[PDB]
């Protein structure tokens, strides 16, 4: 997350951080992720597409920190990862960038509520907030353009979400941009999301309920001028969700 | 891997 203010988890108990471990046994931050059941989180196709072997990925939920543990955390190894058929990435524009990974304990359980696990409620079918509504997003993504390494306290901010109109003008993505995304962004370009936020919530309060409106999917850098940060329209993907969950 | 943003985590670029 570029700009923002770092936060921590009781704030965005639904985020979800998943990582992936490698021989040698080094493990690696691979993309956020959202808690939508108990038992399902879920992100975006993009970050598994080349590695799709459920068995290298370890998630956490309660989690605050990168490389650090937080009281309450809950450790989870992935029993389905579910990738869109239909996923493919142009230049810049992802399609059906959406996954979903059915989460188990060691113990074989799913996630338990606490203060800092919850679920995020999904939106009803065709029912997206006005452009210009004030959005969240939460990761542990890039800072700066300039980072080698990630943020190790969880960070969020806050943007707004542009009309399709506005996000296919030519300086912005012109026909990249499809109906089935959701483009949102700082209106001065300062806050945004970056690389390592992929797959985390876009959050939006549609009818005093927080919903899961967005995933991080895509964008040309990070908070760069008139290149909004691109997100999956989840409430475009209810039927593909509901029949693979 | 490639380091070019949001679409490129955890990818494999030879
Ligand atoms: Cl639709």
New interface residues.
């Given amino acids: 997350i570029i700009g923002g203010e770092f936060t921590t988890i009781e704030n965005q108990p639904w985020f979800a951080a998943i990582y992936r471990r490698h021989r040698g046994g080094s493990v690696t931050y691979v993309c956020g992720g959202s808690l939508i059941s108990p038992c399902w989180v879920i992100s975006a196709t993009h970050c598994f597409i080349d590695y799709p072997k459920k068995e290298d990925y370890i998630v956490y939920l309660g989690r605050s920190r990168l490389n650090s543990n937080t009281q309450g955390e809950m450790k989870f190894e992935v029993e389905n990862l579910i990738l869109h058929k239909d996923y493919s990435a142009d230049t810049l524009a992802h399609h059906n960038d959406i996954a979903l990974l059915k989460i188990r304990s060691k113990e074989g359980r799913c996630a338990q509520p606490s203060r800092t696990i919850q679920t995020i409620a999904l939106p009803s079918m065709y029912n997206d907030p006005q452009f210009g509504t004030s959005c969240e997003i939460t990761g542990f993504g890039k800072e700066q353009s300039t980072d080698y390494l990630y943020p190790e306290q969880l960070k969020m901010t806050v943007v707004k979400l542009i009309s399709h109109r506005e996000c296919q003008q030519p300086h912005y993505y012109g026909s990249e941009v499809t109906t089935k995304m959701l483009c949102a962004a700082d209106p001065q370009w300062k806050t945004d999301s970056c690389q390592g936020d992929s797959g985390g919530p876009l959050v939006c309060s549609l009818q005093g309920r927080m919903t899961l409106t967005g995933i991080v999917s895509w964008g040309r850098g990070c908070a760069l001028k008139d290149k909004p940060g691109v997100y999956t329209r989840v409430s475009h993907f209810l039927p593909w969700i509901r029949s693979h969950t | 891997g490639x380091?070019?943003?949001?679409?490129?985590?955890?990818?494999?670029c030879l």
């Fill in positions: 380091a070019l943003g949001r679409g490129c985590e955890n990818h494999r």
